[PDB]
Structures are given as structure tokens and as C-alpha cells.
Design a protein around this nucleic acid. Structure first.
Lengths: 68, 73
DNA sequence: TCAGCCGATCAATCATAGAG
DNA sequence: ACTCTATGATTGATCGGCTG
């Protein structure tokens, strides 16, 4: 058919070591403070943004788990 | 893990809805739950089907014309 | 005004089921 | 039985909108 608007609209590879540490933190606190964010990032060799986004996505999959 | 496909009927229903809304294939939360109840699958599986359907469609429009022609109306 | 979050979606990729 | 394609699911990251 016709090509509508929607048709016209680097991905970090986390190590097993990083995901394991990210989970651990998650189970300690669902939300992170600016303090603990910088700390985890340094330890894991990541940016605060990546840590921030991973937590965001993690919370959402939790919601999608308690709801299914 | 294991990947189990959907019934022929479920995909029949999903395509019909997809191509009948090709101009804006984004079902609302209500529409999704309705599709789920009719297809016998979850809302999540419905959301994934549409997400995958849209992306693969726009990635190779030509490949799905025959299909679009079938569920056209 | 701005950063963090939410909900939805995207885009690439994984692993399997099915087709030839 | 194998090679190649179709397709369900996962996940890092984006986008619009709300909030403190």
C-alpha cells in the first residue's frame, strides 16, 4: 500500500559480570541515588547513563512480571 | 529457551487487524486486550507481535504486499 | 528550566520452528 | 538431515509527556 509516516520514522554488550552486579544492586534498592549510581558505574566500567537506563528498563520488566 | 508459534487463527486475526489499520497500526491498550482475548494470548505477546510486525514490514515493504493484498479490506 | 521516570516503541540480535 | 527463512522474545536505547 502507501508508505505512511510511521514507516518513515552502538548497543552496549553487557558482560555476565556487569549484569550480575546490576541485578544485585537492583535487589538492594529499586531506585538509585546519584551517589550510588556513580559508584556502580565506576566499578562496572560503565557510564551513569547506561546504569540509569539499565535500572529504568529493569523496573519496567519487573512491572511486566508482577502483572504476568 | 523454546519458541512456540501462534495458532493459524491467532495470526489470522492479528494480520487482519494490522492491515486494516496499516495507516496507523498502533492498537490502544483496550484494543490490545481485546486482540489477546480473541487470539488466546497475552497482551505482551500482542505488543511483541505488533512491534515485530511493524518493524519487519517497513524494513521490506515489498515482501508483504501479497499479504497486504489479502487482508486489504 | 532540567534531570529522572514512565509507558510505548524501536532496532538489532538471539534461538527456534518451519519450509524447501 | 541440512540450509535458509519466518518469527517470538529479549534488551539497550530513544521519544513524547508528566513531575518535582
Amino acid at each position: 500500500a502507501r508508505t505512511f509516516d510511521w514507516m518513515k520514522v552502538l548497543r552496549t554488550n553487557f558482560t555476565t559480570r556487569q549484569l550480575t552486579e546490576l541485578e544485585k544492586e537492583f535487589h538492594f534498592n529499586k531506585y538509585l541515588s546519584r551517589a550510588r549510581r556513580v559508584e556502580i558505574a565506576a566499578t562496572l566500567e560503565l557510564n551513569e547513563t547506561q546504569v540509569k537506563i539499565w535500572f529504568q528498563n529493569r523496573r519496567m520488566k519487573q512491572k511486566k512480571r508482577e502483572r504476568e | 529457551r523454546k519458541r512456540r508459534n501462534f495458532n493459524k487463527q491467532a495470526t489470522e486475526i492479528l494480520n487482519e487487524y494490522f492491515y486494516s489499520h496499516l495507516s496507523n497500526p498502533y492498537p490502544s491498550e483496550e484494543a490490545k486486550e481485546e486482540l489477546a482475548k480473541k487470539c488466546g494470548i497475552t497482551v505482551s505477546q500482542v505488543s511483541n507481535w505488533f512491534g515485530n510486525k511493524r518493524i519487519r514490514y517497513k524494513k521490506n515493504i515489498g515482501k508483504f504486499q501479497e499479504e497486504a493484498n489479502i487482508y486489504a479490506a
